[PDB]
Amino acid sequence: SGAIYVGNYRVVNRHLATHNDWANLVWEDSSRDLLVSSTTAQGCDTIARCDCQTGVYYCSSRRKHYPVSFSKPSLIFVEASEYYPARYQSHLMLAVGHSEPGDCGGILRCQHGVVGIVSTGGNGLVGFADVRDLLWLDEE
Ligand SMILES: Nc1cccc(OCc2ccccc2)c1
Ligand SMILES: [Zn+2]
Numbered sequence: 001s002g003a004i005y006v007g008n009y010r011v012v013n014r015h016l017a018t019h020n021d022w023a024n025l026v027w028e029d030s031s032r033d034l035l036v037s038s039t040t041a042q043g044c045d046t047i048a049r050c051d052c053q054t055g056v057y058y059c060s061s062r063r064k065h066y067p068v069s070f071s072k073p074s075l076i077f078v079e080a081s082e083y084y085p086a087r088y089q090s091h092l093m094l095a096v097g098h099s100e101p102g103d104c105g106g107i108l109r110c111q112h113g114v115v116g117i118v119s120t121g122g123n124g125l126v127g128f129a130d131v132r133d134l135l136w137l138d139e140e
Contacts, residue, residue, distance in 0.1 A: 002105020005043025046113035099126035
């Protein structure tokens with residue numbers, strides 16, 4: 001589980017988004033596993049605007065922060081899960097790391113701020129849904 005709180009936006013995994021997130025929907029993209037919803041309160045998370053390929057992510061199934069190398073966001077084939085059929089997920093960054101289903105929402109951070117959230121796992125790899133291309137998260 002997990003979210004980014006930037007401005008009056010909540011960024012979650014589309015597959016973990018609640019009634020209220022859907023009731024307050026701003027933008028959603030099945031192919032990226034992202035849902036942004038509106039919030040009353042103002043968030044403090046700064047989104048990274050950069051091309052960093054190193055970072056730390058939080059893994060609830062280990063209660064551990066792991067430094068990682070990750071790929072640039074790409075169209076990555078992701079096996080069938082309890083939430084999506086086997087398909088290509090867009091804007092996905094892979095690293096060598098531990099990621100179970102309930103690790104989704106774990107933040108990946110570089111020195112610039114939030115890079116994205118855990119979205120995929122399996123085969124000793126963790127997938128991060130990039131949010132750094134979403135410029136509008138920082139305004140309006
Ligand atoms: N590379 C880097 C530099 C500075 C901070 C940073 O934050 C890591 C982190 C903090 C809290 C939750 C999850 C991850 C990563
Ligand atoms: Zn960065």
